A = this chain, B = another copy of it.
């Protein structure tokens, strides 16, 4: 059972666009948690490379927040109701957070970031599958661009770790 299959089953468990609204709302929660995690790296990182990795985190954060704006506004537009409290984000996100600590290595931060973007790219694939199923071309394009951007991020972060993208 792949991650994509697990996400799909979970999103669609509980109108003609109910699954699309559900996957968008899952993305509201996951993007909010992902942003928090990236912010934690920005704050807690120590080690050689800090001076270029620290501002890189701010760029990733801005990009995640732009995804959140587009996802939430698309959800409102198609007749849904986005999660909009920190407790909802935390409860419904499939991403876990841990207490910040300065003793995490640069390598650990980079590994966690890759796990986050791998998760997001899988969520977006489920988004693609659902929007094709329900015939929402606009939301399909949103998930396409978000997946493409995530995959590029994985390539570059993996390269910094000395690895290939391994999608």
Contacts and interface: CB of A to CB of B under 8 A. Distances in A.
Interface string A61-101: 00000000000110011110111111111100000011111
B86 A89 contact: yes
Nearest to A65: B65
Contact of A51 (B48, B140, B160): B160
A85 B99 contact: yes
Kindly report how many copies of this chain are found in the complex they form together.
12
Interface residues of A, number: 64
29 contacts: A36-B84, A36-B86, A39-B84, A40-B85, A43-B73, A43-B76, A43-B82, A46-B159, A49-B160, A50-B159, A73-B152, A73-B155, A76-B155, A77-B151, A78-B151, A79-B167, A81-B100, A84-B99, A84-B100, A85-B98, A87-B90, A87-B97, A90-B90, A102-B164, A137-B144, A138-B147, A138-B151, A141-B141, A141-B145
